[PDB]
Homo-oligomer: A and B are copies of this chain.
């Protein structure tokens, strides 16, 4: 099923603001069920043709997985050099700098919010982290409170 439309609008807006305000080239959010299973994937910074070429959506593997069990923020300067990295699939843009956070409400997990490749070639900042966390928290509020499906 498609995401509830208000939830989707809210999540795309949160991803866009996060991406813009930390000056990331790419931004993404995975929306999960309560068991960390990826349900939806919201992103920006990649053109449609490149999206078609990559083909398959992410499974929430590699570095992204770390955000789920160690729910504190993670910054890396060369994300795919991390030993948990699965690697980029064919056609995916190479990415180096990373800032990622879990999306939570209290102790419930709702997904992940992560950004890559700060445009000045610089590492993500402390201020960037704090902002990203606040956005994630807002995202957790949206997902937790989102309208559940209803038959006509």
Q: Which of A108-152 contact B (CB under 8 A)?
A: 127, 130-131, 133-135, 137-142, 144-148
**Total contacting residues, chain A, CB less than 8 A:** 30
Is B141 touching A10 in the complex (CB atoms < 8 A)? yes
- Could you tell me if B5 and A130 are in contact, using CB atoms closer than 8 angstroms? no
A5 and chain B: residue at smallest CB distance = B106
Q: Taking chain A's interface residues, is the majority helix, strand, or loop, or is none over half, making it mixed?
A: helix
A134 proximity list for chain B (CB < 8 A): 10, 13-14, 16-17, 20-21, 135, 138
Contact surface of A with B, Cβ cutoff 8 Å: 5-7, 9-10, 13-14, 16-17, 20-21, 105-106, 127, 130-131, 133-135, 137-142, 144-148
